């Protein structure tokens, strides 16, 4: 309990309300093309894959230099949670109709590092790293509130019910953000591992996440709208 963990369940619960305000457009839609839904989910990839890059690792270096030094033990400690990020999400897959269960349990391992990398992007308080990193995660929250509820109509549930299980899918963007402020809070090299280790994790949901040409364009602009977000906030 502090003050740099307020900011972050503030932006773990932007994250559940964004999550939910997609997931509720989908009751007055129900269905999309194909062309729509894949645009959406290569802008949400675009958004998090450059949100590693600039919002992630890079921060996680400059605290790691500073921490550290400059020589490479900064870059090694960020290279080495952004390995053991990758590894926890590799394991998580691996040890895990009845069928929607197994769908929502992939939306919900998908939050995972969303919320965690808001929790640990705020541990040293600095509104420059958490507050675009924050609101590029809430602004492709959207579009994956509304893909996720679709999705889970197409599958099989009504509207209604599929529009409340993605509405509950958002909650481990706050639940992930706490265990954000945990794993980074600890010592002072918590924070560059954490960071190496929630852009590790996000990656490795993204690569599981990417009609080729609609997607591209749709991942070129969460891309650069991450490089613009990251150089204006
Ligand atoms: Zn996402
Ligand atoms: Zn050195
Ligand atoms: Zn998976
Ligand atoms: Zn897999
Ligand atoms: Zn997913
Ligand atoms: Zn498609």
């Known amino acids: 309990n502090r003050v740099h963990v307020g900011y972050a369940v503030l932006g773990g619960a932007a994250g559940f309300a964004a999550t939910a305000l997609g997931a509720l457009m989908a009751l007055g839609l129900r269905a999309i093309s194909a062309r729509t839904q894949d645009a959406m989910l290569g802008f949400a990839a675009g958004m998090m894959l450059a949100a590693s890059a600039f919002s992630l690792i890079l921060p996680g270096l400059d605290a ?4 550290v030094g400059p020589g490479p ?8 949670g952004l390995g053991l990020g990758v590894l926890l999400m590799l394991g998580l897959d691996y040890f895990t109709v009845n069928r929607v269960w197994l769908f929502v349990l992939t939306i919900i391992l998908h939050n995972l590092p ?12 600095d509104l420059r790293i958490g507050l675009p990193l924050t609101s590029a995660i ?10 996720v509820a679709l999705a889970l109509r ?80």
């Open 114 to 125: 969303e919320g965690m990398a808001i929790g640990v992007s705020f541990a040293t308080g």
């Open 154 to 233: 197409a599958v099989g549930l009504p509207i209604g019910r599929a529009v409340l299980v993605a509405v509950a899918s958002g909650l481990m963007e706050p639940l992930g953000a706490l265990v954000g402020v945990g794993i980074s809070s600890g010592f002072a090299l918590a924070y560059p591992i954490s960071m190496g280790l929630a852009a590790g994790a996000m990656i490795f949901v993204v690569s599981h996440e990417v009609h080729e040409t609609t997607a591209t364009v749709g991942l070129m602009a969460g891309f650069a709208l991450m490089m613009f977000l990251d150089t204006a906030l």
């Open 138 to 147: 809430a602004i492709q929250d959207v579009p994956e509130g509304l893909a």
């Open 73 to 80: 033990a900064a870059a090694a400690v960020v290279a080495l």
């Open 64 to 67: 790691a230099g500073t921490i």
